[PDB]
């Protein structure tokens, strides 16, 4: 058996496993976000996607608001959203290590700034809030160090490792011949793609399956499903898992997780039906059917505004048109339930205002993936020899491992005030200050550049010079 047969078998297994979620995903797309999921393959780039079941788009606005709020809260494009750490404090106490950490912080942040990673973080958050499971890929690039590969729900398949993390990724992408020759090279393509290229059929589509699995620890494989030739497209290897696969909530030992879209699917459908019914009722109200009586001699253009009709006064019948049906409807009752359902849908998506979960799967391997790439491209200056290839740890200033730094400041401020307050009653109270050390504690907390804080040698030298400067003149005064 060749590798291609193994890949196809695993793809089929993943497909028959994922078959059970597609109905719910399609319902979510139809009734919450009908521009996201694209299970249909040939639909690629066929832009019709008419709003099919969403008369009232309140769930759509709610999901979008949730995505924007999560972006702003956690990884807002206002620059600071993370700080980098290493798992030994004594090395951190060295000025060189601190300066290198700040340098790698600046380089990381600038590089991710130049990249389009924030766009795909936006898309990831939106689709994760909507469908409950989303993923993006990060790969090296020339015009930019880190590039972000986006995929929408339905076009990719997932599997989880024994650790519970997502480790296997399959996806189907439709690419044109020109893209194939651009990214793989002509000589790696099959006979069909080659002969289409020589015929200058650049824009013709072709199915290609892209797959990431653990073994480099992770191997990448591309191949053309349509061209049954056993030759591969491209195989490579990854050191850290490139996939960013956050799941709102997982029941357990599952590969996809239900999200707020699942909870709001039902109420969305109920609200759509209620809106349709109310619209029908109002149409009945404002354009009722007309029962024009006989003996009115009503020519077709007799009910036109401004027209004057002349009727016999002898016939005492009701010479005046009347509505066809008696409707004494009240909109207050139905509108109450409509507003209640709207509010429930908004509160389902936190529109009035798991979040920490994105730290460990939506940010932890994203930073780890971008970590080695820039290092592979030497985008970071070499680290001090106190550390050797250490897989560095991340602190998320937005919400993670951040408050105690501020809390430590509060403890320091009260302690410094304590020594400060009795400084006005006893100078000897300042003896217990450890000033030379008090700067280090506050520094590590406020997240300031380490070049602000002078090293131990620098302080000693100036103090040594100061004492020598004072002693020399005082000795002559002696």
What is the secondary structure topology, with strand pairs?
Layout: H1 3-18, H2 22-31, H3 58-74, E1 83-85, H4 89-93, H5 95-114, H6 117-131, E2 135-140, E3 146-151, E4 156-160, E5 166-176, H7 177-183, H8 191-198, E6 205-214, E7 218-223, E8 234-238, E9 243-244, H9 260-286, E10 290-291, E11 322-323, H10 331-348, H11 357-376, E12 393-395, H12 403-421, H13 435-446, H14 456-477
Antiparallel strand pairs: 1-12, 2-3, 2-9, 4-5, 5-6, 6-7, 7-8, 10-11
Helix pairs in contact: 2-9, 3-6, 9-10, 12-13
PDB class: virus
Keywords: Bacteriophages, virus structure, Cryo-EM, marine podovirus, portal protein, tail, virus
Assembly: monomeric
Verbal overview:
A hairpin with a 5-residue loop joins strand 2 and strand 3. Helix 2 (22-31) packs across helix 9, helix 3 packs across helix 6 and helix 9 packs antiparallel against helix 10 (331-348). The protein has helices spanning 3-18, 22-31, 58-74, 89-93, 95-114, 117-131, 177-183, 191-198, 260-286, 331-348, 357-376, 403-421, 435-446, 456-477; strands at 83-85, 135-140, 146-151, 156-160, 166-176, 205-214, 218-223, 234-238, 243-244, 290-291, 322-323, 393-395. The protein is of the alpha+beta class and 478 residues long. It is classed as virus. Keywords: Bacteriophages, virus structure, portal protein. The assembly is monomeric.
